[PDB]
């Protein structure tokens, strides 16, 4: 019951700060409009940086140095990756401390090294592929050993990041799916780059081996009856969580690959999910503008809330180095959460 009180305190009068971004001051001036979006938001591994990209085209990055974003510098940058094209996915390159990979639904993958002394985001390199190929998702092996780029259909590329991003291998999606017109919806890496978990739209789930740089199909299981939205992994490495649009959220055992626990209070589709860095609490953002916080070990609801028709598409992410979580606010504005006197659950 300690975790329930902790979450309640994290939802209190204080212990909360508004992330002061461009959209925040925009709403402050125009309220005291059509909300663009938040395409994606992804931390650095060491828990001391953050990056995200709205629909306008501008990607913000913060260098966390304070709790309530007091002394946190902010490198705002205009619509990068072209003037017409906007960013859709980014990976933070766990190898170094500054590099970033960004994709813009085009045939060009941009590698930019963000600098913190100035506000200059200088394009370091651009990678290109076949002219028709339209990739939109990039990922980094959590050891910084492989890079993955995926299309909505009929292309999957793996580069070796060590040897100057030499194109290592590729694969046609129709060889992985073997169904009628499947479109990969979400990808994820295993803890320590050894396997790639892919969730198609027709419902299937595939596990590809990427040991020595040669992709191969290990297995395919008919997990869900609708498109798979998100795929997350437990940090301790014992189970991986699958959330779908048919209203189900399962947790699969890693050693044996069989369903072990099911979330049953759900009655709506899932838009995203996330699990804390301690592998203890599981946050589900359903489609009825509502968030839930479940317990991983037992599987019973321990906290609920209600978005109340503010920023229809929400986002949730748990810090990789503290028990804090960034959650969307009212009008596409981010809202930090903490307790200001508890860095981790154990200290509580």
């Amino acid at each position: 019951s300690v975790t329930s009180k902790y979450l309640q305190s994290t939802f209190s009068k204080g212990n909360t700060s508004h992330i002061e971004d461009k959209r925040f001051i925009h709403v402050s001036s125009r309220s005291h409009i059509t909300p663009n979006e938040i395409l994606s938001l992804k931390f650095h591994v060491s828990g001391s940086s953050m990056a995200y990209s709205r629909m306008d085209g501008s990607l913000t990055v913060w260098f966390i140095k304070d709790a309530s974003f007091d002394k946190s510098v902010e490198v705002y940058i205009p619509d990068c990756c072209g003037s017409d094209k906007l960013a859709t996915d980014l990976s933070w390159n766990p190898t170094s401390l500054n590099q970033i990979a960004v994709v813009s639904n085009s045939s060009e993958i941009s590698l930019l090294l963000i600098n913190e002394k100035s506000l200059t985001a200088s394009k370091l390199r651009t990678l290109s592929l076949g002219s028709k190929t339209k990739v939109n998702t990039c990922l980094y092996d959590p050891l910084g050993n492989w890079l993955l780029a995926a299309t909505k259909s009929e292309k999957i590329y793996l580069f070796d990041v060590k040897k100057d991003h030499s194109s290592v291998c590729s694969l046609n999606i129709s060889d992985i799916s073997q169904e009628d017109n499947d479109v990969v919806y979400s990808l994820a890496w295993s803890n320590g780059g050894s396997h790639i978990f892919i969730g198609f739209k027709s419902g299937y789930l595939a596990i590809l081996k990427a040991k020595h740089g040669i992709l191969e199909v290990c297995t395919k299981i008919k997990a869900h009856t609708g498109p798979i939205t998100e795929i997350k992994m437990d940090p301790w490495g014992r189970n991986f969580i699958t959330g779908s649009i048919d209203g189900n959220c399962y947790v699969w055992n890693m050693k044996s690959l069989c369903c072990e626990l099911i979330i049953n209070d759900l009655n709506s589709a899932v838009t995203t999910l996330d699990v804390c860095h301690l592998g203890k609490i599981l946050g589900i953002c359903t489609e009825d503008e509502m968030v839930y916080f479940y317990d991983l070990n037992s599987g019973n609801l321990l906290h609920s809330k209600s978005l109340a028709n503010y920023k229809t598409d929400p986002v949730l992410k748990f810090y990789p180095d503290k028990s804090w979580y960034i959650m969307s606010g009212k009008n596409d504005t981010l809202s930090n959460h903490f307790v200001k006197n508890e860095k981790n659950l154990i200290t509580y």
Partner: protein, 56 residues
């Protein structure tokens, strides 16, 4: 054991038919085979085909 009430309710009510055909989008191959089974069941159950009145 949960399909037969649904099959009867759509056997003699108007809009539940459209509602059920809307919600078939979600269940897996097992529900499909069992649904086809109970359809053949109802189609073969012993009962009169023509109305009691006449040749209607």
């Amino acid at each position: 054991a949960s399909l037969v009430p649904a099959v009867k309710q759509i056997e003699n009510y108007d809009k539940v038919s459209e509602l059920v055909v809307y919600t078939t989008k979600y269940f897996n191959d097992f529900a499909y085979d069992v649904l086809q089974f109970v359809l053949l069941l109802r189609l073969t159950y012993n009962r009169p085909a023509v109305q009691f009145d006449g040749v209607n």
